[PDB]
Amino acid sequence: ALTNAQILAVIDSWEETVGQFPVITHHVPLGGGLQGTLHCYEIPLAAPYGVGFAKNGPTRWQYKRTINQVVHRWGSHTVPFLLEPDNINGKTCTASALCHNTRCHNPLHLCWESLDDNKGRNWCPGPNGGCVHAVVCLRQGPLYGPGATVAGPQQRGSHFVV
Amino acid sequence: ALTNAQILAVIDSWEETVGQFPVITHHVPLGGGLQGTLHCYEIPLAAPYGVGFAKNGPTRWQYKRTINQVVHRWGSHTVPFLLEPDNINGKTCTASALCHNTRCHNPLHLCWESLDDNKGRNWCPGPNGGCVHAVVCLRQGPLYGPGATVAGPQQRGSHFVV
DNA sequence: TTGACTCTCTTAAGAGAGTCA
DNA sequence: TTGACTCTCTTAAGAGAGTCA
Ligand code: NA
Ligand code: NA
Ligand SMILES: [Zn+2]
Ligand SMILES: [Zn+2]
Ligand SMILES: [Zn+2]
Ligand SMILES: [Zn+2]
């Protein structure tokens, strides 16, 4: 809600509930042929999910609290960042899952950045493979690699140059 | 159904028309602090665009040919790949602009790959900065870099471990 | 046969808000 | 107040199809 005290209360309440979510260990590529371990705090697959949480889509949830008899609701991954600017360079700030695990709500696996930065982490080589993100990646992106291109650049005639 | 000859004729007509688009020289980052040159053949900003071309959206165009009284239409960037498979690994193949210049229709600047591979090139370090794309990038992606993250992973209490 | 417009849809990273009990 | 559902929207890389003359 409006007051700093109320916001801190929201963050602390959210952390307590998510702190009780099942902790699941995931072993992950770091880049450079190295492997690491992440501990994700995963929201349940079906109701009940936890105090204040409800599912609004297959892998979308919201956190709800009643303050001053008014209902305040936020995207379930956004709560750690309620005290942060909600935009940057004219772009909306988004909750960005460093572990690439949508059910995870571990705030140590989340950052707050533009949707472009967020998406781009899917192709990052990872913290031991050359990641240059200022807020460093926790793992190599799931989509990093040579790709599966069907056809490359080509022309039939002689009208074009690179 | 259009024959291979008819399809080849469509590709030849497209190349002949696009080859007359204005050719614009762009200096671009290659990665590794190096600079290169790309020559883009750019569709005009407003009508007329060229024989067979029409704008269906702000930066979307289609190419149309009528053959034996039947109207055929294709996405304007897809024509170089009409003789290629149209899906791979169960994913639709898409025209992927290696020059990251949407108005460009230079077929030497296009490849044919899944939408995920396509998008991921936005963050590639480039052909001289460590690109691992099997069909190599022509330049460093416009979104490669440290990013502009507003807040990193953090907790208020002690409920979480990484 | 052709040009110049119109509209809506896909994907996978993200969101807001309403209806009931 | 709290829980468990419903619906649609945003972005930036990509698409298909209709109307009229
Ligand atoms: Na993400
Ligand atoms: Na692209
Ligand atoms: Zn996680
Ligand atoms: Zn990274
Ligand atoms: Zn180009
Ligand atoms: Zn590349």
Residue numbers in the entry:
A (entry chain B): 202 to 363
B (entry chain A): 2 to 163
Question: What does the study report here?
Answer:
As expected, cleavage activity of H98A I-PpoI drastically dropped. Furthermore, we found that titrating imidazole in H98A and H78A/H98A I-PpoI partially rescued cleavage activity, similar as observed in Cas9 and EndA nuclease. Our results indicate that perturbing the deprotonation pathway not only affects nucleophilic attack but also metal binding, suggesting that I-PpoI catalyzes DNA catalysis via a concerted mechanism. Moreover, the metal ion was not observed in crystallo when His98 was removed.
The asparagine residue helps to stabilize metal ion binding whereas the strictly conserved histidine is suggested to deprotonate a nearby water for nucleophilic attack toward the scissile phosphate.
